[PDB]
Scaffold this active site. Sequence first.
Site, PDB file in Angstrom:
ATOM      1  N   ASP F  56      98.269 136.349  62.554  1.00  0.00           N
ATOM      2  CA  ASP F  56      97.191 136.469  63.655  1.00  0.00           C
ATOM      3  C   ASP F  56      96.139 137.158  62.702  1.00  0.00           C
ATOM      4  O   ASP F  56      96.440 138.195  61.697  1.00  0.00           O
ATOM      5  CB  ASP F  56      97.371 137.241  64.845  1.00  0.00           C
ATOM      6  CG  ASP F  56      96.083 137.150  65.386  1.00  0.00           C
ATOM      7  OD1 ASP F  56      95.732 136.450  66.097  1.00  0.00           O
ATOM      8  OD2 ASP F  56      95.517 138.443  65.689  1.00  0.00           O
ATOM      9  N   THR F  89      90.779 133.700  65.892  1.00  0.00           N
ATOM     10  CA  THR F  89      90.159 134.689  65.299  1.00  0.00           C
ATOM     11  C   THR F  89      90.324 134.678  63.757  1.00  0.00           C
ATOM     12  O   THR F  89      89.430 135.068  62.921  1.00  0.00           O
ATOM     13  CB  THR F  89      90.981 136.083  65.550  1.00  0.00           C
ATOM     14  OG1 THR F  89      92.127 136.200  65.326  1.00  0.00           O
ATOM     15  CG2 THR F  89      90.853 136.532  66.809  1.00  0.00           C
ATOM     16  N   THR F  90      91.103 133.841  63.201  1.00  0.00           N
ATOM     17  CA  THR F  90      91.170 133.539  61.957  1.00  0.00           C
ATOM     18  C   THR F  90      90.314 132.461  61.345  1.00  0.00           C
ATOM     19  O   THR F  90      89.537 132.652  60.246  1.00  0.00           O
ATOM     20  CB  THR F  90      92.743 132.844  61.547  1.00  0.00           C
ATOM     21  OG1 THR F  90      93.633 133.803  61.964  1.00  0.00           O
ATOM     22  CG2 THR F  90      92.934 132.609  59.894  1.00  0.00           C
ATOM     23  N   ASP F 386      98.066 135.295  73.354  1.00  0.00           N
ATOM     24  CA  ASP F 386      97.169 134.253  72.901  1.00  0.00           C
ATOM     25  C   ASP F 386      97.459 132.711  73.322  1.00  0.00           C
ATOM     26  O   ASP F 386      96.330 132.038  73.691  1.00  0.00           O
ATOM     27  CB  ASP F 386      97.366 133.887  71.335  1.00  0.00           C
ATOM     28  CG  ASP F 386      96.733 135.390  70.484  1.00  0.00           C
ATOM     29  OD1 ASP F 386      95.942 136.112  71.146  1.00  0.00           O
ATOM     30  OD2 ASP F 386      97.047 135.559  69.188  1.00  0.00           O
TER      31      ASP F 386
END
Lengths: 538, 155, 548, 103, 40, 520, 99
Positions: F56, F89-90, F386
């Site tokens: 993550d 988020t990446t 997630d």
Amino acid sequence: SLQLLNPKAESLRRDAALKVNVTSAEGLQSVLETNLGPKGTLKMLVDGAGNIKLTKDGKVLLTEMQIQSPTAVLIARAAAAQDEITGDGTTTVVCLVGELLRQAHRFIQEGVHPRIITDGFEIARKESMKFLDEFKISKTNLSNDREFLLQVARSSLLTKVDADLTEVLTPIVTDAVLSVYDAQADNLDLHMVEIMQMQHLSPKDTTFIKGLVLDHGGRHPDMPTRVKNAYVLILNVSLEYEKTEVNSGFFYSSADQRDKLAASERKFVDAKLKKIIDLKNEVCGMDPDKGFVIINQKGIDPMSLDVFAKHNILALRRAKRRNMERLQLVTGGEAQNSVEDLSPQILGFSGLVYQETIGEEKFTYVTENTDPKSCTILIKGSTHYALAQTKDAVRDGLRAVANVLKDKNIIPGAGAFYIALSRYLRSANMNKLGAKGKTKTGIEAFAEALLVIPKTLVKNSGFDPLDVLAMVEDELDDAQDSDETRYVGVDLNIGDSCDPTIEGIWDSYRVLRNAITGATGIASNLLLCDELLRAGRS
Amino acid sequence: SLQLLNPKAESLRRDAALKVNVTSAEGLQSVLETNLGPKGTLKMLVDGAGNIKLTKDGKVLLTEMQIQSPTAVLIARAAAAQDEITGDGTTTVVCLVGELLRQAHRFIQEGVHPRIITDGFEIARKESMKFLDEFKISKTNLSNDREFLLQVARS
Amino acid sequence: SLRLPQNPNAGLFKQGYNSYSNADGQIIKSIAAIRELHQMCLTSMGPCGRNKIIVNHLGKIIITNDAATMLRELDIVHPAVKVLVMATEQQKIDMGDGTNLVMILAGELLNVSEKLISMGLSAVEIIQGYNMARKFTLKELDEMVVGEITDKNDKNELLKMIKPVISSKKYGSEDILSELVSEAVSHVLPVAQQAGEIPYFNVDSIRVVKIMGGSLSNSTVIKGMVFNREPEGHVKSLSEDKKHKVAVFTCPLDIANTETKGTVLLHNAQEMLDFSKGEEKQIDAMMKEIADMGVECIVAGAGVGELALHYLNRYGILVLKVPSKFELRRLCRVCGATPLPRLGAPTPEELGLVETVKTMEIGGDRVTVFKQEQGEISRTSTIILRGATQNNLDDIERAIDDGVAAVKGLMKPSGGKLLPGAGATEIELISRITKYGERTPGLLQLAIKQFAVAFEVVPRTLAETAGLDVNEVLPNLYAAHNVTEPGAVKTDHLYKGVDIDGESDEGVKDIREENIYDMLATKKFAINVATEAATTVLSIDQIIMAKK
Amino acid sequence: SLRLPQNPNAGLFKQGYNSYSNADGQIIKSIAAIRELHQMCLTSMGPCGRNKIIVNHLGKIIITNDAATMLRELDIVHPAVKVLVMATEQQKIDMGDGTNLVM
Amino acid sequence: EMGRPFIIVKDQGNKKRQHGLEAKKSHILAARSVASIIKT
Amino acid sequence: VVFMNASQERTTGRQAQISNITAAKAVADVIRTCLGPKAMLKMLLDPMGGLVLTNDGHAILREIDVAHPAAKSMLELSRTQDEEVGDGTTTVIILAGEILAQCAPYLIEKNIHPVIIIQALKKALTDALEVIKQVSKPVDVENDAAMKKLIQASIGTKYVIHWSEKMCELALDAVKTVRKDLNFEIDIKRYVRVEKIPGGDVLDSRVLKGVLLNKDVVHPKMSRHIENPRVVLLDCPLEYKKGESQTNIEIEKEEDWNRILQIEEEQVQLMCEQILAVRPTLVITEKGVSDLAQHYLLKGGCSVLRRVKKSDNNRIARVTGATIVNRVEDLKESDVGTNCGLFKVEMIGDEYFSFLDNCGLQKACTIMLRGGSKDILNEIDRNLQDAMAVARNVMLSPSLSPGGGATEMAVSVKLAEKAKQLEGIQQWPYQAVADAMECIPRTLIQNAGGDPIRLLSQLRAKHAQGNFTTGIDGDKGKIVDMVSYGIWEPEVIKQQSVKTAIESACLLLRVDDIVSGVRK
Amino acid sequence: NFGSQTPTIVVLKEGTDASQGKGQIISNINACVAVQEALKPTLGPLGSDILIVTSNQKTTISNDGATILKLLDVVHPAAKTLVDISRAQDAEVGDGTTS
């Protein structure tokens, strides 16, 4: 590019971190591989305080020894979680994780990407679960035969101590259950047996008791040690007040009230003792051989000891929290808090109650019950580590016989299950693939890695593991065309094969199921981790 | 038993020494793993004096950079001596020694004695010499072919 | 979990050895390490370029904008930067011109390579992209050449060669610095036209003497060499003219001494009385044969004894001290003399000719004037350089050497081969390589098109250092090259270039009137060295350092 | 060849942990180590046995030939000796006689 | 200062500088100390 | 004097811009291997010793201490994506890190002022949102089979893709249980309870509606199995209450001290009689329970649980429907929990677990996750959060956008047509966003082992044919459209990823100086 | 790859000063003005003199711009340009070195 973020930050990327996961798991396995099997080595844990602990289990070894390498921490936490639910398989999981990495690391140097390697692990593991259902044999536990439970319980004790102490502890761990069973409710609790640590006789002279044993002795000399008929009265209230909730004091006008205010505190103590004395004589008066015993969880006033001494009543204080539930199962009574409600129906019954003086302490023994729902095991030893070595052998033996009642299916041991998975995972044909040449790479690494368990057993015995497994494959080839089902094991005496069902060796269902699933996730995440980074504020 | 003979000494034996020859030769081969081949990587050496050595020869990497591991010292002296007489084979011997130790290390963990492993190396190597006679192709120098010397030099 | 494995089995090498590979963004850090010293030389490019101050460990300060000179005193750490440092030094030695171009061009090839590597281009395909584009670049330079130097020496033609080269180094006044260098070049040329002889030139013939004080306008050109020397016996203006006969002796003037155990041996008092007068007759007999030949000046290469200097003052013979070697070697080239080690009478054919020798005060000390005159021309002339600060005297000396090295480019090739200046050379190559990138199918066109983008630094650097917006000026310059070539010949649009300050908006019409051009022989080696400098960095996948 | 590889297992566990295993030592070696304290009890055995003076860190001196009492006040780093020390402690607690014979 | 060391002459902090009325007062008092010695 | 005691020396000009761009690029370079289904894993070491192994983006950034001041702003960008959405988020850091990497050769080369670039980044941000809106298509939000394929978008990267078939059934019923009609479903992660139980099997799991408590019973006689349970929550402890006034009692008569202890026993019995008025089968309190109040509730069969977490009581009130009342005098039959059933205490050696099953629309659910180890179990917990975050944006808006390289390249193609039509000073910074959107589809190829040169060259030619659905495969790297394989992601994830990267790029480009030593 | 440290290569050797930014060329102006501050009161027939004592304790009193700069050792690169023009003016004409 990490140093630009922080000067003190370090990292190892790609093969730099890959060599760590393979080496750290191999180094941890090399230490714990010698503990697998009945011939395995014995480790002596010595800390800075001088304590000595002898155990062959990996749960105690990894707990006392702090691991600096971050890679082996995942293996230690995986072996710890394996010991929580199944009570067994600590060494097995450690040997599998390090082997799955070494077998897969050989293909990585050949140009194989770790992603397709993890695919071969999940596909081959699901096929092993389907083979586990066909390989296991269901048993009938309604007969409650001793011979079946003695062989299963002995197999776990052979991996702890020698054969001399094993034959002594085998009926003890077999008797650890006995009268505790439920057909419909299926509820089985092994926390009702008590583990006592004392030095008496010899470690091989210990015996099993059919009733509860307590470590508290008689507080007053006149209290009879031996009681033929005793009614256990459970009292959770403290007879001696430690403190008063609301702050208060005694203000006396004249000295004549000093003894009166001191007698004011005597009324509340005698109020609780008044209903207790009336309960003893309520059944029958002037009746010999019938005593009365109180077991209290909290403290008992030393002043009140003479009140029960005249009536020949035994009192026990500072009982454990888990002891209250065990009094209802053993003595058959009911837990009571205050004395406001009493009756002969809520009182327990015991056929024999006696106390023995060992050293400077006195222990209470209760036995001879009609239908006791709980029992205890007295663990005696000749030294300090003898109490810890035998306890680790019993606790690992409790979970072994529990899975027999929880799951009627029993899987043969002696590495017969790991060898059977070797020939099954060689060719999967068109059943489950998902890719051409990508999946078959990870399956071959997982198939040859399951053979470390039978080979590790032979290495601890001082024989050649390649020669032992050579005769195993020759027997399985002729058994398929002969229309005969045979389970080939590993014998460490003469260095030949054997039958786990005939030799009396079996393994638990939950231990082997959680070992394959547990070791697969640990080895998969280490193959999928290409970077080891450390950062933070000191 | 060495601590009784010497007050301060360092020694590693059996499984401790088995990881010495296998792992040290693995890190040395990895340096020359990307060197082998015409598409191989190019390395530059810069010492503390300011000199610059840019070459793909594995012999310069061994002579300029010191090696603390005694296992690679035996390999470095073997790889250097190969380039002395034959002018070639520095990175080849390193890839042969480092890999043969790892290929035989898997069976050492299986319980196979090292002597019977090394005995099979001589039996397999003598067959490479008998096969070398039929593998080689004879060339007559009386033809004075220039194209033959061009293709060999480009190797 | 508390401490990392800290790269196990790293004991294979010493702790001072570090491994850096193209992976993990280190090849990007190597390119980023170039930009640290690249921007240093960007502000130094062009006639508006800014000089830099570099203080060494000994305290010597050299103020120059030359990229080859600045990188000498600087201590370089990153290995691939030394590839760029040593690349600029070779350009200064070989052609003596185009040093700042090699520094800037080789640095921009790595900057555009950062986008090439990010797109996935392998190091092998990037090298093949620059090699194929460089071969097409060198072929287009010969097609775009205009004009020629023709005759060796001319008053006007030497202003189109040395002057545009010295305009970037200490710009100042134009015609003042161009006349001083162009005068000394005409003296060292053998001329001898129609004879068919092979021309010859020496870059070390012209010597620059640094003398503090005065002003640049007071500088002049001296046909002879100028040294700081004090005459021993007497000073002479030599107004008796009729020129002079001069002899040069590389050996000192003194009684010949035995190389082993020189010792005075006197057996009796009879030999002692004649020993004092004996040495006086030896020098008298040797110096008499020189004075009889009409030799008014003697050049010595070592220390001369006092007994030898006595008879030299009797006949009025000047004494000159020439220490070391190279200082004495260039003295004979002026007068055309051949030294001989003996002290005997020189050969009349080996005697030189110097009309006047004067000693006057220039910078506060006595200097000797070897200057020649119209007739009996001499070689290896010197240029007196007057300045207020010694720091300016150092770079102007190297600025004159850049003009002297430009004269060497008129000998080896067939001609001068002038190219359009003001950055017009690198701009025209952009449109030619762009068309060349489309004519080549495959994936190699990515490195070829970006190879022409690296040539955009020349117009942007000249525009940025001139105080002009590169966004307004640069696209307005492509308007001349975007109209390609019309239906009629005689297209003068190839002379458009970048202008400094002024009214901006391109300008200066065609550079043909400006007379500023570039050398073709310089641009040939400037592109080859700069390309191999960036190719070497891109061809190294792994870098290993020691001690740090 | 100047420095040893230090082994890969050096990072595993900690530097303070020491290992004595089969073929790694012990094996009648450590058995020869307890002979120093074994000879101590040999001289204290019998009516002619020799008493031994022991000074604890507190300063109290206990002079006796009893192996269970002597080994109690002595601080011994060697762990396998405690196996023999704790063996003599049971002899004194339970039976109270024959402590010298057990050691 | 702008954050960079400013040194015109070597041994900056070692040498001292006197100016203004304080420089003249130190010169007169230096002569008065010698005068009162010689006047006796 | 020293004048300023904080960074009297100053680094300004292009030197400060390079330090901000280079440090920002290093943040995205480490996570380049963390994108894609073949993405690797990253292990982190905290000073406490706990190991965190995950791919993550946010979990890696917040646990790394960065000494570079401007690079810390890159660490907080994933928090904006995680708190608002929780997915993608990446891709935020990879996109934001590529913008500054592409915007670097301007201030140094073109000498374009940052505000001039900022005006181009804001105009490119508006046009980027329109392209994402055009490529987005609505889908049925009430289709259970359609939402299962949408949750697999974030699962394909995570290690739980093997259990994805089982994991979708766990996350689907979890979001549907806590949501209710009102801003539409207004679902919140605080209502969803994820319990981590070491050991077991991942293949065997079930969604349990209720609260799983690890506390044991206070008395052995307490029945661990109730057919029709009734839950009554009490914040007041069953122990004897003491006044905070510090009342001091002066005892004179001999019967005064004995009466105080009796009154203390009468009130405890009185408080139990107030509870027995409604006759509850179960009693749950957040504080300790005295041993005297235990016996008085044995006659009524009231099972008492003590020391329950404060936030768990609010979750019990949702499933059981009970109303929290502190005083025992206000207890009524309406405040007693109803409709609850299947109350059973399963025996496990580690801890005692209590189960609850439900039959005012707000509900709660407790997901029991059984892993192979405690650290892997922490990964499934993060992967489950997630997975449920993807279904949130699907229920908020019907809009659904393509993913896997199709959305990123669809914007870059539209930016290339408008760039040539600008013909101005803003044309150069406007083309930086077009090349910045290429990092995400290029990263998917580099992690898959394919050739990004030939794939991206033919990929742009496909988008010119009028189809926006052409993506990049994560395994084979095929140019086949994403409609066949079915990769789809909510538009909110695509919008929050682009908006955060543009707002963050304008922040670091405006920093011309870096000073320290303030120590506020 | 040879170690977990992986140091970052610095372009210039440790100990080198910095430049560019804002005010780097201004630092050279203030260095010459400060040297000018001493030579301003020495101008004119009514001007004063400067007393300078070197490390050798050699007393010298000079108002001459050339002699003052010879006594002090100037380590500033830009401030040494005022020393060259003072010695160059004194060598030829000899007067005006202060001006």
